[PDB]
Amino acid sequence: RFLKVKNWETEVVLTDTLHLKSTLETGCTEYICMGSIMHPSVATKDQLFPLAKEFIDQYYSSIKRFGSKAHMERLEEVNKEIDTTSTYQLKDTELIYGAKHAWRNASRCVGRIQWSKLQVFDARDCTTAHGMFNYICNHVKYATNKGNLRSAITIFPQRTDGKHDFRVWNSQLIRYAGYKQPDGSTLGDPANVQFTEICIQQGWKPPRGRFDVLPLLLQANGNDPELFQIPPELVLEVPIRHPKFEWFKDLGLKWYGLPAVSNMLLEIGGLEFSACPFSGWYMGTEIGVRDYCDNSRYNILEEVAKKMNLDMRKTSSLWKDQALVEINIAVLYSFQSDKVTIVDHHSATESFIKHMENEYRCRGGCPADWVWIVPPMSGSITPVFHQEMLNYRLTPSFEYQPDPWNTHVWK
Amino acid sequence: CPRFLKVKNWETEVVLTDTLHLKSTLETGCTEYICMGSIMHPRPEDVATKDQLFPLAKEFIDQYYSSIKRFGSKAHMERLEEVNKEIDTTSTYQLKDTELIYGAKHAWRNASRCVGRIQWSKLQVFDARDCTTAHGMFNYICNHVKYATNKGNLRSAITIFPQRTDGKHDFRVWNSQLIRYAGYKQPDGSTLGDPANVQFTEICIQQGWKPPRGRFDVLPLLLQANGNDPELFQIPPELVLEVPIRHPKFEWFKDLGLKWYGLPAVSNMLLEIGGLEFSACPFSGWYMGTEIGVRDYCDNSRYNILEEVAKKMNLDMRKTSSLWKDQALVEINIAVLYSFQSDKVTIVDHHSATESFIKHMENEYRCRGGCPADWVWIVPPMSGSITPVFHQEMLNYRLTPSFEYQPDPWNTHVWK
Ligand code: HEM
Ligand code: HEM
Ligand SMILES: Cc1cc(CCc2cc(CCN(C)C)cc(F)c2F)nc(N)n1
Ligand SMILES: Cc1cc(CCc2cc(CCN(C)C)cc(F)c2F)nc(N)n1
Ligand SMILES: C[C@H](O)[C@H](O)[C@H]1CNc2nc(N)[nH]c(=O)c2N1
Ligand SMILES: C[C@H](O)[C@H](O)[C@H]1CNc2nc(N)[nH]c(=O)c2N1
Ligand SMILES: [Zn+2]
């Protein structure tokens, strides 16, 4: 059936037909909704050809050549390859199409208005961690672009038997280390304490500061991962200051400009690309709300509210909320003053609404996860708050995968 | 369905095990292939047949006798038999007072969208099932308001009018809440008062209400008894506790002339207990500050005063990346909380409410086997991620007794 979604502020009603094309499961049933569960829970030739066919069919449908000679010949070509090798290889055009569409279908991403403007770097000829490092450096340098950030993805060889996976062990290409202190607390980013310890265990000499860029830990063809230092001139960073509080710079805060997810899995036509780092540019709340103010992260709200001299004895003074806004003002101001691309959550959500209208027009829908699309601060003064959304799983897609250290047979 | 479901809190690492979802009875709207958790609402003549009513009543009676540790008892089987004979001969049945009280508390306890449920067992239940006229409804509602307000020391309460029979004799409160301000559409397109209430205000005016046409005009009650045409009543102003909104630091905030009423009282929902339908069941609690300060004032299609506050704050309103809206939103919520506490009118901030909700949820998982919760509604509309519910995985499912939405009565009423 056709499904209607309404915006309760503008009263715009959109009609969704795209969800009829999905066949992956969401985790909900008719009796339990799992829409706020973070992760609700190697292929044979037998499963692989229907997945390949489905993808080839939508690729040739997208280029207005469904049922053509090229389409029929590609299907037969892919059929032979799965027969004789138990897998197949994507053409370059298919790889680009598949990566852009995995972004387009990412229901949790508020940034998808940009989806067709993705730079795709084919790294499927890589064989070693040294080659991986070269490809990643080129990605970072291209995507950073001296502050004028550009979306990019680098795609390393697909999974074969599951014993020869390419993996970026880092969760993001650029991240700060976290140090569990003798006296029990944490120096740096507490989210990275375990990864930091693996790097130390693997030989990384930690500088033991608050903003130490972690090395890359790179695994090629299932071998033991290897450490590499990203050349510092490639790592663009922004000192955080505030347009009114001159004391803010004294907090010593900074952040990196490039957000680059390096631990997800990219699935296209049944093939699994277990190393596929991709990067865009920040929405300010990703830094200033979650990275700085989550209790299990940098957790600086107390320090800032102290310097603002707010009454912190009772929660109903909203001292946390006041400090939070100023921290996010500082972040946006700092990036903008350094001419590093950043979007505030008002502009981002506004763009997402326009993106939804576009997708409902041209595509018949847009899968969207309200729990993730709505920003972590000031939710209801953004237009996504009042937007009904339908969440459903289309492919190509990005998926989570287990951490490599929980799997890796060390050698 | 799997027998255990685990939810995790990603900030504290606490993992909870849900088995209560095995008792869920009605649909969520989701399927295996689509989630509808952000959809707001996923014939009146049609009432439950005898055959539909028997098992719903037995399910409720069993749950009631299990709750008082008398399951399988003589009284339990006799109650089952008495209900079964009532449905047989009259096509309906009547709840005992104990059952009605148990049912109302559990509809609250089961309300997945309610962050205030740590209080569910303290609900004061007023039995108004002997009411026959709109004048009597007005009497019951006034008594409810006065009891719940309690001079600012608010107490949660519900008043339950007679259940639906054939669907042509419904009791209804046409107001969506017992206390709301009027909204007036002007010829030039602007709105005075509360823009959410323009349509209901117009209904009242057509029914004979003479509107004073101000910014904070309490709407009259529009009350329907026994399926008759609804009738207008004015709540005595001394029963409507109001709070003038001022700010602890900004002396100019009082000059905005704002105020709000103290008692939030939903009156358009349907209470379903054991297959019986109570179409008029107004219930009241106390406010979370953000329900006034974020939504009632800063929603664009509401009072929309972020502009005027930002102007008096002399904020850079040119670019959104100044976060002038976020900054004004906080100050308004500071003023609302300060104004209620100063006048000693019960209110709860979103930090305290969400923290209490996490403790309630943990207790319910331990004592009851789960706690249905709707993340989209439980997370507050400002500062979501600095409250503990943001990081709490939740399972949503529908248990009975429950509060349900029902159609607006002006769309279905057959005018006499
Ligand atoms: C260009 C600017 C972009 C912005 C502002 C943006 C913004 C966001 C935000 C705020 C989230 C929420 C996730 C979180 O809070 O951790 C998200 C999720 C996501 N983004 Fe985007 N993004 C951008 C680009 C991209 C690109 C280039 C890709 C892939 C090619 C992508 C793929 C995803 C995926 C897969 C998720 C889901 C992550 C998950 O499920 O945990 N995004 N994005
Ligand atoms: C005692 C203090 C209470 C507080 C602080 C509270 C708070 C809230 C809040 C913030 C919501 C979401 C509100 C919205 O955005 O519209 C809500 C929803 C709800 N509450 Fe509570 N509530 C309280 C008492 C009660 C009582 C006494 C009942 C019934 C006996 C109740 C039943 C419900 C229901 C059914 C909903 C869902 C409403 C809907 O779907 O529109 N609440 N509550
Ligand atoms: C390409 C891309 C992805 C994402 C989403 C993932 C993502 C999320 C956060 C903050 C949220 N989380 C840590 C609490 C920081 C990041 F660096 C990051 F990659 N965002 C942006 N802008 N671009
Ligand atoms: C008994 C009760 C119910 C509710 C939820 C319903 C409810 C919601 C709002 C918010 C306004 N909405 C348009 C955004 C104001 C209310 F008075 C109100 F009853 N809340 C509180 N505290 N108590
Ligand atoms: C579209 C979405 O369902 C809608 O805006 C919801 C979102 N969450 C909400 N949460 C609460 N507490 N109250 C609401 O009215 C809403 N509205
Ligand atoms: C439990 C809940 O699903 C979890 O905390 C989610 C909520 N929404 C989110 N939304 C975004 N954008 N990013 C997140 O990490 C989360 N976390
Ligand atoms: Zn769902």
Swiss-Prot record, chain A:
Q: Where does heme b bind?
A: C109, Y400
Q: Which domain of life is it from?
A: Eukaryota
Expression sites by tissue: Isoform 1 is ubiquitously expressed: detected in skeletal muscle and brain, also in testis, lung and kidney, and at low levels in heart, adrenal gland and retina. Not detected in the platelets. Isoform 3 is expressed only in testis. Isoform 4 is detected in testis, skeletal muscle, lung, and kidney, at low levels in the brain, but not in the heart and adrenal gland.
Compartmental location: Cell membrane, Sarcolemma; Cell projection, Dendritic spine
UniProt modification remark: Ubiquitinated; mediated by STUB1/CHIP in the presence of Hsp70 and Hsp40 (in vitro).
- The record lists L-arginine as bound by Q172, W281, Y282, E286
**Residues the entry annotates as binding (6R)-L-erythro-5,6,7,8-tetrahydrobiopterin:** S36, V371, W372, F385
The Swiss-Prot or TrEMBL note on domains reads: The PDZ domain participates in protein-protein interaction, and is responsible for targeting nNos to synaptic membranes. Mediates interaction with VAC14.
Q: What does this protein do?
A: Produces nitric oxide (NO) which is a messenger molecule with diverse functions throughout the body. In the brain and peripheral nervous system, NO displays many properties of a neurotransmitter. Probably has nitrosylase activity and mediates cysteine S-nitrosylation of cytoplasmic target proteins such SRR.
Provide the family line: Belongs to the NOS family.
Q: How does it assemble?
A: Homodimer. Interacts with DLG4; the interaction possibly being prevented by the association between NOS1 and CAPON. Forms a ternary complex with CAPON and RASD1. Forms a ternary complex with CAPON and SYN1. Interacts with ZDHHC23. Interacts with NOSIP; which may impair its synaptic location. Interacts with HTR4. Interacts with SLC6A4. Interacts with VAC14. Interacts (via N-terminal domain) with DLG4 (via N-terminal tandem pair of PDZ domains). Interacts with SLC6A4.
Name recorded for this polypeptide: Nitric oxide synthase 1
Origin species: Homo sapiens
Q: Its gene?
A: NOS1
Which span of the parent protein is shown here?
304 to 722 of 1434
UniProtKB/Swiss-Prot annotation, chain B:
Domain comment from the record reads as follows: The PDZ domain participates in protein-protein interaction, and is responsible for targeting nNos to synaptic membranes. Mediates interaction with VAC14.
The family note in this entry says: Belongs to the NOS family.
Q: Any idea which positions bind heme b? A: C114, Y405
Tissue expr: Isoform 1 is ubiquitously expressed: detected in skeletal muscle and brain, also in testis, lung and kidney, and at low levels in heart, adrenal gland and retina. Not detected in the platelets. Isoform 3 is expressed only in testis. Isoform 4 is detected in testis, skeletal muscle, lung, and kidney, at low levels in the brain, but not in the heart and adrenal gland.
Cellular location(s): Cell membrane, Sarcolemma; Cell projection, Dendritic spine
- Top-level taxon in the UniProt lineage: Eukaryota
What does this protein's UniProt record list under function? Produces nitric oxide (NO) which is a messenger molecule with diverse functions throughout the body. In the brain and peripheral nervous system, NO displays many properties of a neurotransmitter. Probably has nitrosylase activity and mediates cysteine S-nitrosylation of cytoplasmic target proteins such SRR.
Q: Which residues bind L-arginine?
A: Q177, W286, Y287, E291
Q: How does it assemble?
A: Homodimer. Interacts with DLG4; the interaction possibly being prevented by the association between NOS1 and CAPON. Forms a ternary complex with CAPON and RASD1. Forms a ternary complex with CAPON and SYN1. Interacts with ZDHHC23. Interacts with NOSIP; which may impair its synaptic location. Interacts with HTR4. Interacts with SLC6A4. Interacts with VAC14. Interacts (via N-terminal domain) with DLG4 (via N-terminal tandem pair of PDZ domains). Interacts with SLC6A4.
Provide the protein name: Nitric oxide synthase 1
Binding residues annotated for (6R)-L-erythro-5,6,7,8-tetrahydrobiopterin, in chain numbering: S38, V376, W377, F390
Description of post-translational modifications: Ubiquitinated; mediated by STUB1/CHIP in the presence of Hsp70 and Hsp40 (in vitro).
